[PDB]
């Protein structure tokens, strides 16, 4: 007892909302898409293959769930979760005066069962030496204390931490190194007099 | 109490339902744990026993029972520096690494005294 | 190279967590042995081969319970049955040589 059903194309409404049809990622089932679309290399006397039984149409990623109307409807519902950016920091010049420390953090995503990526542990710290309270002696000591991690032309000190397994451990290690560098650039020891 | 579990399963019998939407499918599987924690960070589910940077970088506190002025300190400082730059191992593994050298040196006592250097 | 410079370099290594006192390049090898994970402990090395025993046993068991169908194993079984019917089968262990 075989039974063949006409697809949803004959029942699709002209003004039906498409986010209701394709809310999330789908394998592009041809019975749910009333759009007659032909994908494939044509034959000399033939035409490109229709949507039924077409493997090329299934291979490609479908963005039917990301139509502009659906994107509008989704983004409107997300406005309640976001917070407003302060207008007092529109230009970088005041951002450098108020928050001079920059923390470069890397986040990664990959398809598979695994999450752990060894490149995620690296944390970068960038601080401008023109926004600190170093004097001449402590500055000239700090330059030689850091070495090549300070850019003389741009006047930025970079601290790249990898030694800690976790991102938070790398971060608090980096702030500890910044504090220790600041404190040790101030102490004048016996051997500095020679 | 098994009766609490029976009441909970009687509640879950009417709470649960075959899925009506892909969004609900992902919500249920996220509550179960199958779907990833979005936004995806590479350190989810791994706390490393709640350790901090001072437990990984500073291992000098484990070198107290060794000769301070001998070549054992010269070798253990390189071992400690190597272990402190190692993000692939947890703190307990480094503790065991130090303890291995500890017991090896405390076991082989005749060779250190025969080598001509006074070691403990 | 000066006394001031070598003191600065010694302080820099102590502050950054590097090797403080002078050591030879051949001696930095033991620093390196612990600075990274050894070859035998890397997942790319000790997890190289998937468990073919699990794969083969699982597929055989589902074939026996009738949920997976192994066409290659069916072909082998049919060929062996034809071989045993024609009369050249697998001899018993211990009688091939002497008997």
């Amino acid at each position: 007892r075989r039974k063949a059903l006409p697809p949803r194309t004959e029942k699709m409404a002209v003004d039906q909302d498409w986010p209701s049809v394709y809310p999330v990622a789908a394998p592009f089932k041809p019975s749910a898409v009333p759009l007659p679309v032909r994908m494939g290399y044509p034959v000399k006397r033939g035409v490109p293959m229709a949507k039924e039984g077409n493997l090329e149409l299934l291979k490609i990623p479908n963005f039917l769930h990301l139509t502009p109307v659906a994107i509008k409807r989704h983004c409107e519902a997300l406005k309640d979760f976001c917070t407003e950016w302060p207008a007092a920091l529109d230009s970088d010049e005041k951002c450098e005066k108020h928050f001079p420390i920059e923390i470069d953090t890397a986040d990664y995503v990959s398809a598979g069962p695994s999450i752990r990526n060894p490149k995620a542990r690296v944390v970068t710290l960038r601080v401008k030496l023109s926004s600190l309270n170093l004097d001449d002696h402590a500055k000239k000591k700090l330059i030689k204390l850091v070495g090549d991690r300070y850019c003389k032309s741009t006047d930025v000190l970079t601290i790249k931490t990898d030694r800690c397994p976790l991102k938070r451990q790398n971060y608090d290690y980096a702030v500890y190194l910044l504090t220790v560098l600041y404190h040790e650039s101030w102490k004048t020891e016996e051997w500095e007099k020679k | 109490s098994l009766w609490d579990i029976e009441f909970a399963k009687q509640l879950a019998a009417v709470t649960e339902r075959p899925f009506q939407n892909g969004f609900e499918e992902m919500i249920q599987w996220t509550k179960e744990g199958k779907l990833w924690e979005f936004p995806i960070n590479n350190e989810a589910g791994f706390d490393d026993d709640g350790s901090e940077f001072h437990e990984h970088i500073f291992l000098d506190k484990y070198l107290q029972d060794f000769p301070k002025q001998g070549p054992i300190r010269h070798f253990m400082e390189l071992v400690t520096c190597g272990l402190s730059k190692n993000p692939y191992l947890s703190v307990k593994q480094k503790v065991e690494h130090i303890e291995w050298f500890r017991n090896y040196f405390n076991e082989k006592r005749v060779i250190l005294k025969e080598s001509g250097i006074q070691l403990n | 190279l000066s006394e001031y410079a070598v003191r600065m370099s010694r302080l820099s290594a102590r502050l950054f967590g590097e090797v403080a006192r002078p050591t030879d390049s051949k001696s930095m090898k033991v620093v390196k042995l612990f600075s990274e994970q050894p070859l035998a402990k890397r997942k790319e090395t000790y997890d190289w081969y998937p468990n073919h025993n699990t794969y083969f046993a699982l597929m055989g068991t589902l074939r026996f319970l009738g949920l997976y169908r192994d066409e290659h194993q069916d072909f082998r079984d049919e060929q062996l049955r034809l071989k045993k019917l024609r009369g050249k089968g697998k001899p018993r262990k211990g009688e091939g040589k002497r008997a």
Partner: peptide, 18 residues
């Protein structure tokens, strides 16, 4: 030759790395 004494415990206690 000469070795300089570095206060590691004091720095760790001061800046929270003990």
């Amino acid at each position: 030759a000469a070795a300089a004494a570095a206060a590691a415990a004091a720095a760790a206690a001061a800046a929270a790395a003990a």
